[PDB]
Each structure stands twice: as C-alpha cells, then as structure tokens.
C-alpha cells in the first residue's frame, strides 16, 4: 500500500468542485472533505491552509511522519496532492468521526469496554511513534479531536500536521514555536521551546481523563488533581457507573494511569510502553 500521488483534478471532482456539501470541517488547521475517489475508495480529503508558510511545513510534517509509516492505530495517509499553491492530503475515511464529537454528543454511546479499547488503541499508536520509529515521532497535538474511530470503533491517531522527528540519541527536541491545544499543553512546554515524547504522554493523559470523566479538558486536570486529594469516587463519568458499579476498581487504576501521565515533572511520567504494560496488568 504505497503513498499514491493523486491528480488535483480527481480530488476536485470527487468533492464536486470542493462543494460545501462535502465539507466536514474547516478553518483552524485544514479544510476536510468526505469523498469517494473514482475507484470507489471512501476517503477524507484535507485541503491545506496558508501554503508557503504554516501550510507547507504542515504538509511535509505529515508526509515525513504518518506518510512514511503504517500502523493499526494510526490513521492511514492514502495519498497526497502537491500541485502549485495547492496542498491536499488524503486519508481513509473514519466512519464514526472523532472521539471529541462522540464524547460531546451531537450519536454513538460509548460503554466502558469500548472506551478502554480506545484508550489502549490510542496508547499503542503513540507507543509505536515513540519507541518503534527511528527517528522517534513526537505528535505534539494529541487530543480527543485527533483520535478518530473506524467502523469497529477502534482508535486511530490523526493530524500529524505539527509532528516532528527526533533522534533516539536525544531526550528532547528544540523547536521554533509553541505548539499544542489549550487544555492539553504540557506545563513545561510553556517554559521553553522544547518538545518530547514525555510531552505527548501528558497530552495522552488528558484524553484518558476525557474517557474516564466524560468532561472536556477546558482546567480538568487541575481540580481532578485537587479532587484526588478528596474523594476520587466523584470524578468518573456518571454513565460509566450506571453500567456496573463493580468496575470502579479498574477505573481507579486506570485513573492512576492518567494521573501519572499528567505529572508536572516530565521525568516522573511513564513512557507509553509503560502505559501499555500498565493497561495489560489490570485485566490479566
């Protein structure tokens, strides 16, 4: 499954001249269209914004990361269009959209057994990025809106527009600007222009809180750490306890994973491999 170079004309007609009816997300980072290629492929087409600046760097960021690897828990980049001032990226369509859209209902009710699979799945995706890839890949924008869900509701990490490569001989990578989303930014990212895999782990933690709490990050991490000083049986998603109050024991342990990821000290945070190992220790 090689990275296809798609003609701009194909993408143009597949979206009916980039018509509004095909649009499923715009502005901010990229314009996204739901489309069917002339071979019948169900895809998502991102039309990049502000080329020859933030846009072109974003393009190469994805091309050099997600575009050169494949993994069960990473949204596959199927193709690209680099023509003139136009930058487009083509992905496999994710049926049930983003985790954020689902946790913040317009939808599909997520029971705990599926939420924990989403957590394990997303965790495995980042683990692959941090440990299996050389150079390592720092995502730098892990969040619920960048966790997509296929037909099987398995998590697939998306949006490598701000991702960067780091040698395995380095603990951190020094950047040019502060990247991330409010509510997800690692506290140490505010103190210096440096990013790291531990930074990704922090951001992952927030997502794990969203799955546990059911709340938006906007902070969530703050009073959770403060209610951790009080009674922990007060923060979990109400709809989770309705299913069975017996699974509250693994919830707390899963909460113990989330809080470790969210430590202000980057050195104290677990690696995503340790996170995976911790997830495995809970059920079996």
Name 63's bridge partners: none
Q: Other CB atoms closer than 10 Å to residue 89's CB: what's the count? A: 27
Quote the CA–CA distance of 62 and 44 in Å, as a whole number: 15
CB 257 within 8 A of CB 211: no
CB 30 within 8 A of CB 46: yes
Quote the CA–CA distance of 25 and 185 in Å, as a whole number: 23
Which experimental method was this entry solved with? X-ray
**Short-list 55, 188, 205, CA closest to 142:** 205
Quote the CA–CA distance of 203 and 183 in Å, as a whole number: 9
Q: What would be the CATH architecture of the domain defined by 94-284? A: Orthogonal Bundle (1.10)
Catalytic entry in 10, 141, 200, 237: 141
Quote the CA–CA distance of 125 and 156 in Å, as a whole number: 7
Radius of gyration of the chain (CA): 19
Q: Which residues contact 207 (CB under 8 A, 6 or more apart)?
A: 99, 119, 122, 142, 143, 144, 147
273, with CB counted inside 10 A (0-12, 13-18, 19+), is middle
Q: Measured between alpha carbons, how far is residue 249 from residues 113, 117, 215, 233, 236 in Å?
A: 14, 17, 20, 10, 12
CATH 1.10.510.10 in the chain is located at 94-284
The binding site consists of: 24-32, 46, 92-94, 98-101, 141-146, 159
Token pair in block for residue 250: 């693994």
Phi, psi of 87 (to 5 degrees): -120, 115
The binding site for ATP consists of: 24-32, 46, 92-94, 98-101, 141-146, 159
Q: Which residues contact 14 (CB under 8 A, 6 or more apart)?
A: 33, 35, 36, 37, 38, 43, 45
Beta strands in 132-237 (DSSP E): 136-138, 147-149, 155-157, 164-166, 173-174, 194-195
**Short-list 50, 53, 5, CA closest to 28:** 50
Whether 170 is a known active-site residue: answer: no
N- to C-terminal Cα separation, the chain: 35
Please tell me what resolution, in angstroms, this structure has.
2.4
Q: Other CB atoms closer than 10 Å to residue 103's CB: what's the count? A: 22
Residue 44 Rama label (left phi>0; alpha psi -120 to 50; beta): beta
Q: Give the SS3 label for residue 92.
A: strand
Name 156's bridge partners: 148
């Amino acid at each position: 499954k090689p990275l296809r170079k798609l003609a701009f004309a194909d993408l143009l007609q597949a979206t009916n001249g980039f018509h509004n009816d095909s649009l499923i997300g715009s502005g901010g980072f990229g314009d996204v269209y739901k489309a069917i290629l002339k071979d019948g492929s169900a895809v998502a087409i991102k039309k990049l914004i502000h080329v020859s600046g933030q846009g072109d760097r974003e393009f190469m960021a994805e091309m050099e990361t997600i575009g050169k690897i494949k993994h069960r828990n990473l949204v596959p980049l199927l193709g690209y269009c680099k023509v003139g001032d136009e930058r487009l990226l083509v992905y496999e369509f994710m049926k049930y959209g983003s985790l954020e859209d689902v946790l913040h209902d317009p939808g599909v009710k997520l029971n705990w057994s599926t939420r924990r699979k989403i957590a394990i799945g997303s965790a495995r995706g980042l683990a692959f990025l941090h440990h299996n890839c050389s150079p390592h890949i720092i995502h730098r924008d892990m969040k619920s809106s960048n966790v997509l869900l296929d037909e099987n509701l398995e998590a697939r990490v998306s949006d490598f527009g701000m991702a960067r490569l780091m040698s395995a001989m380095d603990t951190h990578l020094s950047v040019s600007t502060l990247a991330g989303t409010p509510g997800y930014v690692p506290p140490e990212y505010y103190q210096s222009f440096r990013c790291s895999t531990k930074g990704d782990v922090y951001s992952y933690g927030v997502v794990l809180l969203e799955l546990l709490t059911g709340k938006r990050p906007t902070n969530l991490v703050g009073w959770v750490k403060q209610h951790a000083k009080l009674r922990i049986s007060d923060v979990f998603d109400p709809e989770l306890m309705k299913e069975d109050p017996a699974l509250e024991i693994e919830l707390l342990q899963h909460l113990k994973v989330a809080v470790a990821c969210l430590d202000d000290r980057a050195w104290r945070r677990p690696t995503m491999v340790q996170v995976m190992a911790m997830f495995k220790e809970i059920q079996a």
